[PDB]
Structure formats: C-alpha cells, structure tokens
Ligand binder design. Structure first.
Ligand SMILES: *[C@@H]1O[C@H](CO)[C@@H](O[C@@H]2O[C@H](CO)[C@@H](O[C@@H]3O[C@H](CO)[C@@H](O[C@@H]4O[C@H](CO)[C@@H](O)[C@H](O)[C@@H]4O)[C@H](O)[C@@H]3O)[C@H](O)[C@H]2NC(C)=O)[C@H](O)[C@H]1NC(C)=O
Ligand SMILES: *[C@@H]1O[C@H](CO)[C@@H](O[C@H]2O[C@H](CO)[C@@H](O[C@@H]3O[C@H](CO)[C@@H](O)[C@H](O)[C@@H]3O)[C@H](O)[C@H]2NC(C)=O)[C@H](O)[C@H]1NC(C)=O
Ligand SMILES: *[C@@H]1O[C@H](CO)[C@@H](O[C@@H]2O[C@H](CO)[C@@H](O)[C@H](O)[C@H]2NC(C)=O)[C@H](O)[C@H]1NC(C)=O
Ligand SMILES: O[C@@H]1[C@H](O)[C@H](O)CO[C@H]1O
Ligand SMILES: O[C@@H]1[C@H](O)[C@H](O)CO[C@H]1O
Ligand SMILES: [Fe+3]
Ligand SMILES: [Zn+2]
Ligand SMILES: [Zn+2]
Length: 341
C-alpha cells in the first residue's frame, strides 16, 4: 500500500508538495487541483489519497464519504505530558477582527460594511459568521449583507468577490486558493490590515501570528496587536488578548481526510512523515519542514505542532461536533442530504 498521493490546492501548495515528495523518497507524491472541492473530487475518484482540510470542507468531504484520519494539533500548554500525537485537539477560536482606529464598529454595526473571509465554505471565514448573521437578520441574502467583500470561492462578478485582488498579475481574482492575495486566514487578515475590508473573519491565532514582528512579510511587518480589536457577540470590543471570551465559536481543528478504505494507510504513512518533517522532525529544520511555508499555511497551518490520532475513531459528524454540523446545514438551507458531486 505504501505510496500516498497528496492533493495540493493551487501552484504554491503544489510547489511545497513536490519538495515534500522529493524529500520523502516519493513515499509521498502529488496531485494538484485548483480548489479544495476539486481535491475532494480527485480523492473520491481515487486519483489522490488525501489532503488536510478546514472543518467546512470536512463537512463537504464527509457527506461524500471521506473520513477524518489525523487532526492538526497546535501549540497548547494544558495537557503537557502527553505526546502531541496522542493529545486531544482543543479547537481554534473563530473571531471577527477589526482595526481599533475603526472606532464604533461593533458586531451590531456590520451591515453594509466591507468584509474579509478566508474563503466561502470555511469555518471561521464563512460558516460561523454567516450562519450567525443569517440567524440574526432572519434573511438568506448574505450576499447582500456586506456592501463589498472578498470571499474566495464566490462569484468573481458578485460583490462577495469585489475586494479580492487576484494574483501578482491580477489574475485568478477570488479563486479559493493561495494565488488570491486575500485567500485564507492570512489573506483575509491582510485584507483587513490593508483596510481593503472593515472586518476579517479569521481565527485567534491569525491575528497573533501576523502582528508584533511575528511575520516579516511586507504588509505585516509594521502591524501592532493594539491596532486591532475583536468584535464579541454581545456588541462589545475587546483587545486581541481577550479571545477566550470574545469569539464567534470554537472550530474543530483542520484535519486530514482520505477515502475510508485508504485511511489506515494514509494514517501510517503520515505519522511516519511527521516523525521526519514535523515540529521535531528528524530532518525538519535542515531538510524539509512539513508545517512551515513562509507564513502561507500551505497544506497545513504553520502553527501545527503535529498531526494527532483522533480517538473514538470518529465519524466526520462526530469530529465536527453536532453544534457545528447543525449550523452548516441550517446555513446551506439558503443555497436535504447527499454528496455535492
Ligand atoms: C442558527 O439558528 C439555528 C436555529 O436555532 C441553529 O440550530 C440549532 O442549533 C442548536 C445546536 O446547538 C440545536 O440545539 C441542540 O438540540 C439538540 C437536540 O435537538 C440537543 O442535543 C442533546 O445535547 C446534550 C448535551 O449537550 C446530550 O446529552 C443529548 O444526548 C443530545 O446530544 C443539543 O444539546 C442542543 O440543544 C438545534 O437543534 C438547532 N435547531 C435546528 C434543528 O435547526 C444554528 O445552530 C444557529 N447558529 C449558527 C451558528 O448557525
Ligand atoms: C491565540 O493565538 C495565539 C497564537 O496561536 C496563542 O498565543 C500564545 O499562547 C500560547 C500559550 O497559551 C503560547 O504557547 C506556548 O506556551 C509555553 C508554555 O508556557 C510558552 O513557554 C511558549 O511561549 C509557547 O509558545 C504561544 O507561544 C503564544 N503564541 C505566540 C507565538 O505569541 C494563544 O494561546 C491563542 N489562544 C488564546 C489567547 O485564546
Ligand atoms: C518510505 O517508506 C519506507 C517504507 O515504510 C521507509 O522504509 C522503512 O524504514 C524503516 C525505519 O522506519 C526501516 O526499518 C526500513 O528501511 C523500511 N521498512 C519499513 C519497516 O517500512 C522509509 O522510511 C521511507 N523513505 C523515505 C526516503 O522517507
Ligand atoms: O468534536 C470536537 C469538538 O467539536 C471541539 O470543539 C473541537 O474539535 C472537535 O474534534
Ligand atoms: O462548492 C460548493 C458550494 O460552495 C456550495 O454552496 C456548497 O457545496 C460546495 O461543494
Ligand atoms: Fe479553518
Ligand atoms: Zn465559546
Ligand atoms: Zn463514534
């Protein structure tokens, strides 16, 4: 069984994946697609074995029968004696960030503002905030809530893509992959940091990893945590140090999914690959680091300490949790059960 074919979303993840391939002795090989959904399709077809996914894509993947294999585990202090690989996942905090200088902007004053989403169908950048909004406004017209937005994956012509910038040559505007300047956690935050949008829907970690010198990237260099605030659901504004108490929801960690019949082997190969390229990987610093990508979260989030065993051999609905799964169906009622491909 020993060859695992990873699916890369976009050319940058492709470049990284090939490096990982070369270094793995072709134990890991690559397949590329322009979107996560397409990568879900190559795995369904058996042309790729796996990829790591945000919760919202796990939902889509799971309805098609794909199963969670290993979950991303970030740097947590609590539960410190257990190996990261066997450490329960704690989840991440989906937050709404704004510029402090943008005084008076609260959760209750978001209507008609400019927003930045990681990508349509993602947990923190879309399902959480939009499900909240739809719920709160009683309307399915979330395409009309923000005056303008950058929501990779939405219709390029629509105002949900208006603030997206595309790539270096302005091409691929709004594609849900790293080619789009404002794609993902980093891109949605850069979208806010450059005042292209008024609010960014990312996770707690995003704000920290890109402020106070934590990045070096041109646009982030000069960012200071105090210039940002989190919008709490109670209409309040708190510093980005108050995430445990000012968030939209806690999200299930991004996780690797593969076809049910390939899971066991994808799991085995993966644990052996992070032992080599993970946070303490034998060859990480020197040769290759699976969880680093110049701050671009390619294939995995950069703050991933390791990929952990799941426990309860959970279904995708159990891994996402009932609370989260209800939100996504209730939100998708605006677009009853079956694989979207
Ligand atoms: C948007 O608005 C909709 C409509 O209100 C939201 O949908 C509702 O979401 C909640 C999910 O938290 C859900 O309530 C649960 O109902 C379950 C049973 O019907 C309860 O299950 C029990 O939980 C116990 C432990 O907590 C456990 O002991 C027991 O075995 C069982 O698991 C559960 O506790 C909650 O009460 C509503 O059912 C759901 N409404 C429906 C059916 O549409 C949606 O989440 C809202 N928000 C977002 C973010 O989009
Ligand atoms: C919001 O996201 C932040 C980035 O992921 C994260 O920030 C920091 O918090 C954790 C601890 O809570 C630190 O983790 C480690 O803790 C050890 C043991 O005490 C420290 O010695 C060490 O510094 C280590 O990093 C992170 O360092 C730190 N992140 C950075 C780079 O600033 C928050 O935990 C997170 N959660 C919130 C605030 O809700
Ligand atoms: C690719 O996978 C192969 C097969 O799993 C690896 O080779 C094994 O490495 C183990 C040590 O963990 C040795 O006992 C043997 O040499 C191999 N057989 C086993 C037990 O699988 C190898 O580590 C990987 N190659 C590269 C370049 O990473
Ligand atoms: O099921 C769990 C819970 O939903 C938690 O909030 C995060 O991680 C998921 O795997
Ligand atoms: O890509 C599609 C669309 O975004 C849809 O709205 C939900 O199912 C996904 O697979
Ligand atoms: Fe996510
Ligand atoms: Zn909470
Ligand atoms: Zn179960």
């Amino acid at each position: 069984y020993t060859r695992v074919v990873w699916c890369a979303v976009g050319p940058e993840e492709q470049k990284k994946c090939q490096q990982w391939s070369q270094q793995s002795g072709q134990n890991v090989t690559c397949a590329t697609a322009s979107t996560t959904d397409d990568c879900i399709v190559l795995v369904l077809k058996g042309e790729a074995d796996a990829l790591n996914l945000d919760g919202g894509y796990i939902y889509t993947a799971g309805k098609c029968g794909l199963v969670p294999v290993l979950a991303e585990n970030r740097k947590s202090s609590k539960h410190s004696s257990l190996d990261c690989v066997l450490r329960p996942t704690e989840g991440y905090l989906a937050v709404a960030v704004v510029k402090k200088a943008n005084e008076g902007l609260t959760w209750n004053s978001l209507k008609d503002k400019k927003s930045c989403h990681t990508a349509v169908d993602r947990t923190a950048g879309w399902n959480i905030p939009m499900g909240l909004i739809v719920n709160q406004t009683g309307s399915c017209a979330f395409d009309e809530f923000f005056s303008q937005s950058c929501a990779p994956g939405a219709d390029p012509k629509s105002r949900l893509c208006a603030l997206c910038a595309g790539d270096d040559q302005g091409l691929d505007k709004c594609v849900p992959n790293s080619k789009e300047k404002y794609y993902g956690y980093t891109g949605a935050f850069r979208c806010l940091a450059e005042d292209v949008g008024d609010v960014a829907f990312v996770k707690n970690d995003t704000v920290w990893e890109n402020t106070n010198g934590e990045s070096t990237a041109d646009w982030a260099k000069n960012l200071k945590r105090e210039d940002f605030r989190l919008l709490c659901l109670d209409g309040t504004r708190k510093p980005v140090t108050e995430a445990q108490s000012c968030h939209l929801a806690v999200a299930p960690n991004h996780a690797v999914v593969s076809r049910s019949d390939r899971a066991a082997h994808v799991e085995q190969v993966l644990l052996h690959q992070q032992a080599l390229f993970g946070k303490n990987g034998k060859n990480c610093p020197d040769k290759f680091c699976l969880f680093k990508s110049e701050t671009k979260n390619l294939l995995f989030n950069d703050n991933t300490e390791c990929l952990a065993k799941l426990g309860g051999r959970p279904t995708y609905e159990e891994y996402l949790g009932t609370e989260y799964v209800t939100a996504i169906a209730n939100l998708k009622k605006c677009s009853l059960e079956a694989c979207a491909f």
